[PDB]
Amino acid sequence: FTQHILNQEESREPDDKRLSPEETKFAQEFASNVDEYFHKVATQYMPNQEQRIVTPNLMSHVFLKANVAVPAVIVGVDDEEVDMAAGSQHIIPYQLVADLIQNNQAQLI
Amino acid sequence: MDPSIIEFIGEKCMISIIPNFSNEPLHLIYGPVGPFRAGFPVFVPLWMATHLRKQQKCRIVPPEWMDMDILEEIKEEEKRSKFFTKMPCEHYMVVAQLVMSTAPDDVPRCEELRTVIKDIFDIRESKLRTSIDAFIKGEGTYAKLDNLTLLEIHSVRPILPYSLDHIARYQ
Amino acid sequence: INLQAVKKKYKEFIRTFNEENFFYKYRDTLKRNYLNGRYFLEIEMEDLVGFDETLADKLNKQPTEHLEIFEEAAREVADEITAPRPEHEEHMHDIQILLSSNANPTNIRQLKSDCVSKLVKIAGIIVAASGISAKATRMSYALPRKCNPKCPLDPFFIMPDKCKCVDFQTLKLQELPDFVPQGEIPRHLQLFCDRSLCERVVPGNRVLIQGIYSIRKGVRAPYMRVVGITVDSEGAGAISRYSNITSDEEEHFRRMAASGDIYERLSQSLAPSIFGSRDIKKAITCMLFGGSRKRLPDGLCRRGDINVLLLGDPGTAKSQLLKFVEKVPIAVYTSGKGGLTASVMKDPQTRNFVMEGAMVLADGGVVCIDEFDKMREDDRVAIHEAMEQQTISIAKAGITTTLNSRCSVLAAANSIFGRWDDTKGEENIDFMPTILSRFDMIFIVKDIHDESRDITLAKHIINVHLSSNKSAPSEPAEGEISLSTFKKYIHYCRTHCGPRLSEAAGEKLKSRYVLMRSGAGQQEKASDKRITVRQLEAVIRISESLAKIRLQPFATDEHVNEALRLFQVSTLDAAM
Amino acid sequence: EGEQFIKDIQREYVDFLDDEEDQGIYAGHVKDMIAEKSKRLIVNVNDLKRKNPQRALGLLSNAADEQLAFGRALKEYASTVDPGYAKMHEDLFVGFEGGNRHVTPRSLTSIYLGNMVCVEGIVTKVSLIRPKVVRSVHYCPNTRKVMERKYTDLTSFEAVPYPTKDEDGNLLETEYGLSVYKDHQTLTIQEMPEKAPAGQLPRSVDIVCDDDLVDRCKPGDRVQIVGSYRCLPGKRGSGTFRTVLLANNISLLSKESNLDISREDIMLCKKLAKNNDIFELLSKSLAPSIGHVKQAILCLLLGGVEKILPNGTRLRGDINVLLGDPSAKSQLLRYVLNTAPRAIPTTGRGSSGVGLTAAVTTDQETGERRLEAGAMVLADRGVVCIDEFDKMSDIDRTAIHEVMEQGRVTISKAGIHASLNARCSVLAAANPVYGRYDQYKTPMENIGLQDSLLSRFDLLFVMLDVIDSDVDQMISDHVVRMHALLHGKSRQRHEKILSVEFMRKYIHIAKCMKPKLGEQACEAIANEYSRLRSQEAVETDVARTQPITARTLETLIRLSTAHARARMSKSVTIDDAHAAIELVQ
Amino acid sequence: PNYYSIEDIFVTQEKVECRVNTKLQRMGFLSDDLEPGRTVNLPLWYIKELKVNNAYFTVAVPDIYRNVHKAVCEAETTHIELGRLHPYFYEFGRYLTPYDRNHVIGRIIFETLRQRVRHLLDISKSDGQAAKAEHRLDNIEAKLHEAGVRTNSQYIEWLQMT
Amino acid sequence: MFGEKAFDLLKELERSSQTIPAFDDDGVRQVLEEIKAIFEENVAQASSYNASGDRSLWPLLNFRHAALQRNKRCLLAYLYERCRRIKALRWEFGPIIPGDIKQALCEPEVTFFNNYSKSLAAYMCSAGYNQGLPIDLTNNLRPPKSLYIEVRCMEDYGKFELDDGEVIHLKKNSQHYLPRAQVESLVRQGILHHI
Numbered sequence A: 001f002t003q004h005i006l007n008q009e010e011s012r013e014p015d016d017k018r019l020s021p022e023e024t025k026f027a028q029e030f031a032s033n034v035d036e037y038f039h040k041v042a043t044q045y046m047p048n049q050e051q052r053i054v055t056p057n058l059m060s061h062v063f064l065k066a067n068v069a070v071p072a073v074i075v076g077v078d079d080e081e082v083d084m085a086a087g088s089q090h091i092i093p094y095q096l097v098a099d100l101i102q103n104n105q106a107q108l109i
Numbered sequence B: 001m002d003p004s005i006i007e008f009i010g011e012k013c014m015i016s017i018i019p020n021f022s023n024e025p026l027h028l029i030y031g032p033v034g035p036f037r038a039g040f041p042v043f044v045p046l047w048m049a050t051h052l053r054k055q056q057k058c059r060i061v062p063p064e065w066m067d068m069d070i071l072e073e074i075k076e077e078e079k080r081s082k083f084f085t086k087m088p089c090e091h092y093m094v095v096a097q098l099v100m101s102t103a104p105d106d107v108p109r110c111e112e113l114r115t116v117i118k119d120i121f122d123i124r125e126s127k128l129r130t131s132i133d134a135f136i137k138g139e140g141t142y143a144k145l146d147n148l149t150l151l152e153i154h155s156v157r158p159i160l161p162y163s164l165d166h167i168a169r170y171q
Numbered sequence C: 001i002n003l004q005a006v007k008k009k010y011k012e013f014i015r016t017f018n019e020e021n022f023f024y025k026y027r028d029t030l031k032r033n034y035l036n037g038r039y040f041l042e043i044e045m046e047d048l049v050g051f052d053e054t055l056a057d058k059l060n061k062q063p064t065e066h067l068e069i070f071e072e073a074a075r076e077v078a079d080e081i082t083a084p085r086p087e088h089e090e091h092m093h094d095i096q097i098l099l100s101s102n103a104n105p106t107n108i109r110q111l112k113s114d115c116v117s118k119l120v121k122i123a124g125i126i127v128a129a130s131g132i133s134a135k136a137t138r139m140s141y142a143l144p145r146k147c148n149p150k151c152p153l154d155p156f157f158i159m160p161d162k163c164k165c166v167d168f169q170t171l172k173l174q175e176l177p178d179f180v181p182q183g184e185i186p187r188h189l190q191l192f193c194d195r196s197l198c199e200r201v202v203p204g205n206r207v208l209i210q211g212i213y214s215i216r217k218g219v220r221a222p223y224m225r226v227v228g229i230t231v232d233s234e235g236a237g238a239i240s241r242y243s244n245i246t247s248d249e250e251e252h253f254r255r256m257a258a259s260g261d262i263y264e265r266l267s268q269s270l271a272p273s274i275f276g277s278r279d280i281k282k283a284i285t286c287m288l289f290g291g292s293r294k295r296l297p298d299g300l301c302r303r304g305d306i307n308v309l310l311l312g313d314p315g316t317a318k319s320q321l322l323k324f325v326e327k328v329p330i331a332v333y334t335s336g337k338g339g340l341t342a343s344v345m346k347d348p349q350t351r352n353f354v355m356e357g358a359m360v361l362a363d364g365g366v367v368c369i370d371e372f373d374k375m376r377e378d379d380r381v382a383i384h385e386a387m388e389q390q391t392i393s394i395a396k397a398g399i400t401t402t403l404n405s406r407c408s409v410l411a412a413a414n415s416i417f418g419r420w421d422d423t424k425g426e427e428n429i430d431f432m433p434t435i436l437s438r439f440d441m442i443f444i445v446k447d448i449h450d451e452s453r454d455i456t457l458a459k460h461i462i463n464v465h466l467s468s469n470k471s472a473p474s475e476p477a478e479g480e481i482s483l484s485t486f487k488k489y490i491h492y493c494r495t496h497c498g499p500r501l502s503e504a505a506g507e508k509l510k511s512r513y514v515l516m517r518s519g520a521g522q523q524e525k526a527s528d529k530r531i532t533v534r535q536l537e538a539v540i541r542i543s544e545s546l547a548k549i550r551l552q553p554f555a556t557d558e559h560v561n562e563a564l565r566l567f568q569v570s571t572l573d574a575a576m
Numbered sequence D: 001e002g003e004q005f006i007k008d009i010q011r012e013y014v015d016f017l018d019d020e021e022d023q024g025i026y027a028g029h030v031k032d033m034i035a036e037k038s039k040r041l042i043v044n045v046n047d048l049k050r051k052n053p054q055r056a057l058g059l060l061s062n063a064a065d066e067q068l069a070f071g072r073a074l075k076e077y078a079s080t081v082d083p084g085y086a087k088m089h090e091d092l093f094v095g096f097e098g099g100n101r102h103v104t105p106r107s108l109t110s111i112y113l114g115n116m117v118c119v120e121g122i123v124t125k126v127s128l129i130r131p132k133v134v135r136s137v138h139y140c141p142n143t144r145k146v147m148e149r150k151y152t153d154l155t156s157f158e159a160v161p162y163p164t165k166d167e168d169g170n171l172l173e174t175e176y177g178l179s180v181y182k183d184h185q186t187l188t189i190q191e192m193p194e195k196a197p198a199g200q201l202p203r204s205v206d207i208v209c210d211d212d213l214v215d216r217c218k219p220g221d222r223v224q225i226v227g228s229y230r231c232l233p234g235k236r237g238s239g240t241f242r243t244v245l246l247a248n249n250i251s252l253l254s255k256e257s258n259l260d261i262s263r264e265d266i267m268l269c270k271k272l273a274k275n276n277d278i279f280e281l282l283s284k285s286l287a288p289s290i291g292h293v294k295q296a297i298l299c300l301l302l303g304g305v306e307k308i309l310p311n312g313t314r315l316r317g318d319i320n321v322l323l324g325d326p327s328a329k330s331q332l333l334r335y336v337l338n339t340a341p342r343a344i345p346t347t348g349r350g351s352s353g354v355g356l357t358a359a360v361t362t363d364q365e366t367g368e369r370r371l372e373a374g375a376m377v378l379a380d381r382g383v384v385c386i387d388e389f390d391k392m393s394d395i396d397r398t399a400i401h402e403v404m405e406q407g408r409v410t411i412s413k414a415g416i417h418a419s420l421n422a423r424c425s426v427l428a429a430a431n432p433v434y435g436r437y438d439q440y441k442t443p444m445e446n447i448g449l450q451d452s453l454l455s456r457f458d459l460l461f462v463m464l465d466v467i468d469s470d471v472d473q474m475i476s477d478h479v480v481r482m483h484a485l486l487h488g489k490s491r492q493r494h495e496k497i498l499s500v501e502f503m504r505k506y507i508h509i510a511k512c513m514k515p516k517l518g519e520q521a522c523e524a525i526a527n528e529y530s531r532l533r534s535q536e537a538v539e540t541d542v543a544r545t546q547p548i549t550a551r552t553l554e555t556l557i558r559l560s561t562a563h564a565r566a567r568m569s570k571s572v573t574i575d576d577a578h579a580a581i582e583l584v585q
Numbered sequence E: 001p002n003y004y005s006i007e008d009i010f011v012t013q014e015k016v017e018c019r020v021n022t023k024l025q026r027m028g029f030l031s032d033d034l035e036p037g038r039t040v041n042l043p044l045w046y047i048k049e050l051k052v053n054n055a056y057f058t059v060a061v062p063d064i065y066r067n068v069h070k071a072v073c074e075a076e077t078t079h080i081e082l083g084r085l086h087p088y089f090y091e092f093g094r095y096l097t098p099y100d101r102n103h104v105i106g107r108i109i110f111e112t113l114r115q116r117v118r119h120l121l122d123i124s125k126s127d128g129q130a131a132k133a134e135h136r137l138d139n140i141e142a143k144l145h146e147a148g149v150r151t152n153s154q155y156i157e158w159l160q161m162t
Numbered sequence F: 001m002f003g004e005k006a007f008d009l010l011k012e013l014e015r016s017s018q019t020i021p022a023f024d025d026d027g028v029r030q031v032l033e034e035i036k037a038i039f040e041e042n043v044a045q046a047s048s049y050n051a052s053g054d055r056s057l058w059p060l061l062n063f064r065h066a067a068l069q070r071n072k073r074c075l076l077a078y079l080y081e082r083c084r085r086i087k088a089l090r091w092e093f094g095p096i097i098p099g100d101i102k103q104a105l106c107e108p109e110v111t112f113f114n115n116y117s118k119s120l121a122a123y124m125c126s127a128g129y130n131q132g133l134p135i136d137l138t139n140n141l142r143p144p145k146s147l148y149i150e151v152r153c154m155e156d157y158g159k160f161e162l163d164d165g166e167v168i169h170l171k172k173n174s175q176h177y178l179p180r181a182q183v184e185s186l187v188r189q190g191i192l193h194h195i
């Protein structure tokens, strides 16, 4: 995911929440290196004039563990997230829920 | 997902045994451990009974959910369990293997338990396919965990979803 | 008793099979058969001794009942595991069992009254067997009198909407050729097979068998069936259609393939007792491998395999070589005296004109013969035809079922007066050229003199012919070993690859054949007195065979310089 | 009336009758309102699954009486829609017509019992016919009440069933006329065998049929069928088991009328007919995989032309030819077996049934006395090929003389005088006595058979192979070309204007016309035959000019006729003369 | 520039049987002028971004892709058999769907692969030796096929210390 | 072939699983002699009056675009799988025992290789300790025991053990003055499934 991680980090460069600095050290090291290795392919005729992305997808179905109210604690998520529980799960994807986990309300396995 | 990765999870669980020593050249490690003196129980995790029983130091005994009778009535509860059944510690498919591997030099009834635990294992596993022969319409807000365990569910995890998302996108 | 068996023993037997490593069961095997529609299971006969010490000694005496107590135990132990919950046993289903052993094989000559209704083990050979009619279990033998105003004396209407159906095949067995047929001919026997083992044995194979010798009606009749067949390992006694080869075998195989010292290794493979004759031998092995049977949108199903020739003075070991080529996937051998007709006979039952059909029996195998010479021409024309189109036709009575068979062919010969013809001109064959033309190889044999060769062929043979020598020192040579490997290896290599040429091979081959035909025509004109598509369409098959060897699909003409320098032997042989 | 669900099933097949799709189309103007009266309605299972899946796959799992319920519902419907044609008071079986499970005759294997499924195989054993016994409107003059009694058997439905002295001893005049009858039939199928493993014998099946479906092809064609399974008799309750098939509509898979032939495809044909130099194309069409004939082999593929007189006699219209040392003559005949209809190779070594029968029977179920078939009537109105001719015996040759030349087969097998209509042509292959030879010794006597046949055939001819040192590189060029799409667009072509399928589809009209002779063939043919018999026997060719007769006329007219069919010019010209005759010279 | 995978470019190559509506110029890889109607094969890359409403080429489907088989195989979605005459058959519409003008194909595709949500009841094991059912395959279902075989083959190794 | 060969490009490493004899720099030479044969046409008509500004040239743009796509991404594979497998064995050892050859370094790969080595340098610096304790992480997993003895193994070559012994002959019978810091590299490269 060395491609558009950088877009969020230039959105704010978050604090200790999102990333750590040495990873950014690595990221710029690698992003420079691939180009200076591409050196000996096409750099006397490198491109003359967006589309290269790697890890964008946010719908890989995961398994949730709820940890909360045995009734349906309804929270910020797009679907009918009804029937939340204390020991149970109704499966969902990750786009609609990157919210509970940042609350540490819910868990994965 | 591995045969041992989840033992770096599951093997941390606790049992209670009796060692044969006094306190060791060091008596106790600063932590939840209790003091070491022969002839009496002590409560431990499971990354030592491996190390201990074959180090020819002590005995070992199991928890209570390992028996015949409880694991002969839980199955007939499971038969009508249209959803799920009773769950003794929820990663009990691995403590059994790491117990019945070494321990049986002294443990009682070290086969018929294997019989019943597999007899529950298979029935619940075959249950966990028939979710799929009814799972319709991309229903990715409705599914089952209610008294499920973990050591079965890695036996599905990389097959279905990794493709299910980018496939049943259409609905 | 009927139930104390199923009550606990068989029912818990499968449940109880336990070695840690958590494999040692027949439960998981049963389920992984079930999932894929197979409906069978295998066992040994000396594992029950690992469970008890009596039941086996009861299994031998009353097998026919025990082998149904098994089926009941099998399904009542398996449908519990069918149940995911009570909602996916759509309906139960029946199974058949297999048992095996390694005890000892017997011979047909001891199948007598005492060995009746009793388990056995034998080892024989097959000729042919029937088709697949039917048989079933129940529906809605004596069908007694009572009826169930009157309804008289056995009015029973079968309800075959409500009947059932299993299989029926009637296999066969002939003996082996080393158990006193010497002052006799070989007898044989007919058999019986039940549910899932039709299309398990084609005729022309070596068998192990587990069976039982039981009757149907004091001169009453014999028969036998399968009680859990298995097969033979005469090197690879039965490795002819299926695959219990494993990734280990594929690994060893393909690791042999890339080993680029295998072909010159294999030019010394056939004879651990014969000296010399290596250029003769570099393409007796490719004949097995075969090339490509490339059909096209038009008609041209062009000739797949290749064909062999040899004629020479005796004293150069022709016979042993051809017997060895028979020995090492499937093939048969006659020589002369046999056909031009095929088999339109008549079963005296029903009086029809059935077609019994034996170039049929090499449809993936091959055939070898000696003496095309000393068998006259009334039976050469059907074989004129077969080996160019393989559409073996029939037009005798009111049937025109031009069936077909893909076979190759190997030819030994004997010319009159030795090399008398072979020095001078046109007495190479005495008969005709269009079966000398319609072949590929052209390899003559001579026995010329030289004292060094004389003395060497002297001592080379003595150490061979002294006291059954080769126990120790044959395999200790480099790589000249294990025909069994060759059998299984071929039955891989022929049945995978679909090779064909490159670009660069085509022009070089065309120019080379051009020079060949031009040299022949110049020999015509440089003597003031006197080149088929077959020669090109055959020599291409040696490139086909070589690429088959190394498993590369595409092959080069520099790879094939060996092949064309083999064909050079033919060219400079028929030099005149 | 058995289990009560049967009537739910009746109304559930009525539940097909909702709205426009079946309540509008499938019932009404369907057979009797359109007045074809072919009782069998056309069913398609897919719509059934699309309406009633429990009643769709209930059928392809069981057929106890669902057919009968279909028929009951159909009569209940048509009795309302149009009772005038409701006077056929019988079962009125229907389609079940329409790849769920299409196993071979080799694999009708111990399951599918109680199912309705698909088979393929050979049209074979086109066999004997009989009628069937149904029900009869009996009568008694003493009492004058026309009673009734229906008769069954298992091959019609489940159950199993003449009256004399019925009530107490009164009269019984069994009244026919109002007693009815179906038509009945029995024959078999064989696996189209070339899917065989020739280490095994292709297996067989058994099929039975019924009334309005009877005897719908000739044995020697390819076919599809879709039918159900039944198995009656004893099986150690008394001795083992047997099979039979029913419940089907017929499907032949080698026709042209199967094609939706409107007035447009004929329009393309007749448009392109104006193109003149198409003969050289169609010659280069037949054998795209091989030098070398086929300009005329085409005419052999056009049958011929039949010419009769008032109440006199008739002639045979077709052509037969052949010419060569070994190495592309025994690979140019499989352009017939699987290019064009009714093509049957024969052996070169097969006796006793090229036209013989042997008439053998052995106590048939009925009284089958004596008959079998042959290998020419199979090829009526078409063609035959053979390989390895000269090695054939000198036994059956004279049968070839007769049935070729006389154009009728009027034979007897020692029991019965026989006559039929077989009007076909034939080929074979060729081999000289001594291998590679036709030129230095003589052209003739290198063949070695009677000089009567070249009258029966048409052509004394020649075929060889080699070249000198200049053109040898040219044959190298062509051989390397044989050994893509480039420069066969220098060959201005398309894979639809030159192909197999459209090429086949130019059969119908070229064989439906009758391109009569004008007059201007006459003086040409006469002067040319004059020159032919005069000076064909000089300048190195005296002995190769023996077999001329007055038979080159019927061949010439066959030829110009055929060539007049390949463009449908309902007339005949001098250009047709040249294109027809240049072969002979 | 794609949803990559190890099948990086088995992606935009699938050839079709597109028709012609009006004229073009200078076909290049195959006249700066042509007729209205001449059938021609075409790849998928350059056609990927030429404006479904715009009409150089026409409403155009292949014959296996033509609605007849595809309809009777959303009714024969029980044993529609594949082989290798069209090995991949699982995300073709994941470009090609909207270009019909008769909106048919997406529902077909989804039902077919919803049958794999119904199908792989059985494929749960490697019972023995090498290869079992290795030619009814799209080579995206082959991925998860090998994957499930792996997970079971290692889960086996779990089943004891084995 | 027209964009197929990368599956052929890794085939130098077809046998090189864990019994590897050696490795090479295959499949770049004629293949990037391509790219200077084609740029001529790819930028031939740039804003040209060659066609007077007309729509027809759109296949050419996408031709260039897809050509770049295939070329660059096969390059990413020939880079990344090499680095990744080498990264596996480079987790099985530091630059203590580098590759079998160091002759198949596709020349610019010095930067690539050594940068990843400095990936692990950063790893060591921050992880292990804040100052950086290079944290023994994937080899030499003996519980605390003796420091200096030798033992038996199974015939490895490459012979790069520069660590703290005079000459130890790192194969079967590398059986000589071996300290702990000498033998600090091996757990799995094909060596000590058997002491």
Ligand SMILES: Nc1ncnc2c1ncn2[C@@H]1O[C@H](COP(=O)(O)OP(=O)(O)OP(=O)(O)O)[C@@H](O)[C@H]1O
Pocket (backbone or CB within 6 Å): C273, C274, C275, C312, C313, C314, C315, C316, C317, C318, C319, C320, C413, C414, C461
């Ligand atoms: N070149 C050889 N090297 C070693 N042994 C040989 C050789 N040639 C022949 N022999 C011995 O002689 C026997 C082979 O004779 P073979 O049966 O081939 O003669 P043949 O070819 O059948 O003669 P003919 O063709 O006239 O029947 C073998 O049993 C072998 O022991």
Ligand SMILES: Nc1ncnc2c1ncn2[C@@H]1O[C@H](COP(=O)(O)OP(=O)(O)OP(=O)(O)O)[C@@H](O)[C@H]1O
Pocket (backbone or CB within 6 Å): C300, C302, C303, C388, C434, C533, C534, C537, D289, D290, D291, D292, D324, D325, D326, D327, D328, D329, D330, D331, D388, D429, D430, D431
């Ligand atoms: N011009 C050609 N067209 C088609 N096939 C050719 C041509 N030239 C050579 N061949 C091939 O060469 C082989 C020639 O053998 P062919 O079948 O003609 O023998 P044959 O004429 O049947 O022999 P015989 O007449 O003695 O039975 C065939 O496989 C054929 O495909």
